């Protein structure tokens, strides 16, 4: 993985030594070169993972997450250069450096062979994200960080150090072969919660989800793209690595949290039918889609893991495109109110076509990989219990509705009279929409690369 | 009830509106033209039978039981004109009613396709922007203190001046764009 | 379909309806002929004249504009305002 980390770090002199007008073009060009380089991670085999060194390895789970992570950086640089054109040049380079450092943390979070190195990179990703949201966010306690680190990261730290002292190693490749059955006790119960709850908050879990529809609203566009596209999937990646050690206790301890997700994807979806903020609607949709990833990881069948990694990749693409569409409207009406600007197909036909495609992939229109992930998760949960299909299907009613209501509220009807600064679609914005949607459509032609270690 | 200029319907206006909606629901009940024509003359005669009534409280009483008669004899689906609200063709072309200001944001190579049109539009914009301050100072002295009482706008007064708040009424889109 | 109406055509159709009406003598009807003051008509007859206009041209005039059309010149002007003629 050293052939990807070193160009990522050479993007730091490539963004600081460049000229005063060249720090978007150079960074976009060379990050697209690294994203083209990222396809060599697809050297995968049906038995053995692509094990590079003692520190780095990349199986078919981390590989689509890595390709999406290295693809997300040029798209964030295309997204965030408009509203930073009035920003200072040194703070502009600071923003690009925070994005490059966050990519640097992510690409060796996903390829950490050893679990405490995964933990350090996992909790190192939060610092550039928090700098981006607090500094280049728009509006104005802080108790969410404290409640996160009490129930989350340090129980995970003590848990991984305990596994280190018991097993002798936190190598995932060794723990594939030295995994022991974890019996019913109270020590193993709090051990299981200490291993799981940090990723539970990072998904988010329903009831622990309220940090996200505010962190998306207080973010810039690149912060929202990297939150909903990659950083929410660190929880799913960590769960798919940590549920190896946590058997067979999960077979009776997944019962509460699955409830919180199986009802949660009912509630938050319905919350998406009662939103006034477009960006909060996309945020609660992200919660409702990650609930199925939580369910599919906790029931731990092969069809569920295939559906969950397909849903992670497809939801990263779809939610990033929806946040970029919300950015394109926020950079015209200067207000995130969804009922404010209406009828925008009468003015911007191609942008309304991108809205149509994004809403079709949001409600899992087949043969998209959204529907492939959604469908495989529904198959595995029907195998889990034959009643959950109702709770699936009711969800698949509501996930249509707010996907099209958001399409009907903003893009249809009579246009707003007192808004006359609706410019035509810039070429950068439609380029951003097409670089979100055309990979998402092309993966429908060959989905087996985004179906995880056990296709 | 809810009026732009006035604040209430008068008793005479209530009788006119109840008579007109009564004939519309009657024609909804009376599909054929001659049958509706006979019953319309009957309903006209029944409204004429209580025309020269001078007591206002007794007239309000008769109007109350007339509203009960109207509610008792109404059609579930009344006839609605297509461009009228509630009709089948209502607000159909509002997806084609593009506002005028987007014409200010075209490329010059698609403004050069219509040279005379934009060359004629620029003097409309000039007339608007040199009429605006005159009609603003015409508003601020003709409106009484405490805001305008009614929603009625005054006309122009000087030979060479335009009425106030006129641009989006004149440049509003057509019924068939 | 939907032929382009002109003010001369709209005026001739409005006066053609009102000359088919038994309380209007066709030699006294003019464009400035008020209904309550030049024809001496009832308010009920004015409601029925506006309803005949509505049955004629194929659209509905609201009551806030139906209570204020008191001569055929204002009727032709309101139909011109709500049909965009002489383009």
């Amino acid at each position: 993985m050293l052939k990807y980390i070193i160009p990522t770090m050479m993007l730091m002199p490539l963004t600081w030594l460049s000229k005063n007008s060249m720090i978007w073009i150079n960074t976009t060009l060379h990050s697209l070169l690294i994203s083209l380089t990222s396809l060599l991670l697809l050297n995968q085999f049906g038995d053995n993972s692509l094990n590079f060194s003692l520190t780095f390895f990349s199986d078919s789970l981390s590989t689509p997450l890595l390709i999406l992570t290295m693809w997300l950086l040029p798209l964030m640089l295309m997204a965030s250069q408009h509203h930073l054109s009035k920003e200072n040049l040194a703070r502009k380079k600071l923003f690009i450096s925070m994005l490059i450092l966050l990519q640097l943390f992510l690409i060796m979070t996903f390829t950490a062979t050893e679990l405490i190195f995964f933990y350090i990179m996992f909790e190192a990703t939060l610092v550039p994200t928090l700098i981006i949201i607090t500094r280049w966010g728009n509006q104005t306690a802080g108790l969410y960080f404290l409640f996160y680190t009490l129930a989350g990261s340090l129980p995970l730290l003590v848990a991984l150090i305990y596994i280190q002292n018991t097993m002798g190693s936190l190598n995932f490749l060794i723990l594939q072969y030295w995994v022991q059955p974890m019996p019913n006790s109270w020590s193993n119960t709090f051990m299981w919660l200490a291993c799981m709850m940090a990723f539970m908050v990072k998904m988010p879990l329903y009831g622990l989800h309220l940090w996200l529809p505010k962190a998306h609203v207080e973010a810039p566009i690149a912060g929202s793209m990297v939150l909903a596209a990659i950083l929410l999937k660190l929880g799913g990646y960590g769960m798919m690595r940590i549920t190896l050690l946590l058997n067979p206790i999960t077979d009776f301890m997944a019962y509460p949290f699955i409830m919180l997700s199986l009802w949660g994807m009912i509630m938050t979806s319905s919350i998406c039918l009662r939103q006034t903020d477009l960006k909060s609607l996309i945020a609660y949709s992200s919660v409702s889609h990650m609930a199925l990833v939580i369910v599919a990881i906790l029931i731990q069948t092969p069809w569920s893991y295939m559906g969950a990694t397909a849903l992670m990749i497809a939801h990263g693409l779809t939610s990033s495109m929806l946040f970029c569409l919300a950015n394109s409207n926020y950079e015209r009406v200067h207000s995130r109110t969804m009922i404010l600007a209406r009828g925008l197909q009468t003015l911007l036909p191609l942008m309304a076509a991108w809205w149509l495609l994004a809403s079709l992939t949001n409600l899992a229109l087949p043969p998209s990989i959204n529907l492939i992930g959604e469908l495989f998760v529904v198959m595995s949960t029907f195998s889990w219990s034959n009643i959950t299909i109702i709770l699936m299907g009711l969800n698949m009613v509501i996930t249509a509705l707010y996907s099209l209501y958001m399409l009907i509220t903003t893009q249809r009807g009579k246009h707003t009279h007192h808004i006359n600064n609706i410019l035509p679609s810039f070429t950068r914005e439609n380029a951003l929409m097409s670089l979100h949607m055309l990979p998402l459509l092309l993966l429908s032609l060959n989905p087996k690369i985004i179906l995880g270690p056990l296709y | 009830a809810f009026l732009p200029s006035a604040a209430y319907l008068t008793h005479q206006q209530k009788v006119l509106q109840l008579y007109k909606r009564a004939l519309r629901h009657l024609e909804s009940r009376c599909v054929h033209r001659d049958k509706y024509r006979y019953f319309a003359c009957l309903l006209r005669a029944r409204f004429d039978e209580h025309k020269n009534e001078k007591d206002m409280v007794k007239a309000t009483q008769l109007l109350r039981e007339a509203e009960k008669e109207f509610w008792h004899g109404q059609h579930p689906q009344p006839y609605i004109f297509p461009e009228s609200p509630g009709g089948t063709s209502y607000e159909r072309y509002e997806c084609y009613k593009v506002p005028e200001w987007c014409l200010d944001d075209w490329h010059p190579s698609e403004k050069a396709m219509y040279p005379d049109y934009f060359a004629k539009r620029e003097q409309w914009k000039k007339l608007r922007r040199e009429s605006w301050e005159r009609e603003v100072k015409q508003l601020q002295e003709e409106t009484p203190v405490g805001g305008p009482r009614t929603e009625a706008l005054p006309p122009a007064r000087k030979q060479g001046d335009l009425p106030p708040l006129w641009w989006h009424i004149v440049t509003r889109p057509r019924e068939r764009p | 379909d939907a032929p382009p109406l002109t003010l001369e055509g709209i005026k001739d159709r409005v006066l053609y309806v009102l000359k088919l009406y038994d309380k209007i003598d066709p030699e006294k009807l003019s464009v400035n002929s008020h209904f309550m003051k030049d024809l001496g008509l009832d308010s009920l007859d004015q409601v029925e004249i506006i309803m005949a206009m509505e049955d004629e041209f194929g659209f509905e005039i609201p009551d806030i504009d139906a209570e204020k059309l008191m001569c055929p010149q204002e009727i032709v002007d309101y139909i011109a305002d709500k049909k965009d003629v002489y383009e």
């Binding site: 036909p349 035509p424 679609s425 | 490329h107 764009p177 | -």
Partner: peptide
């Protein structure tokens, strides 16, 4: 004749 100008947004971009 008597053609009417189609009021439309910018389709060039």
């Amino acid at each position: 004749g008597k053609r009417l100008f189609i009021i439309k947004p910018s389709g060039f971009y």
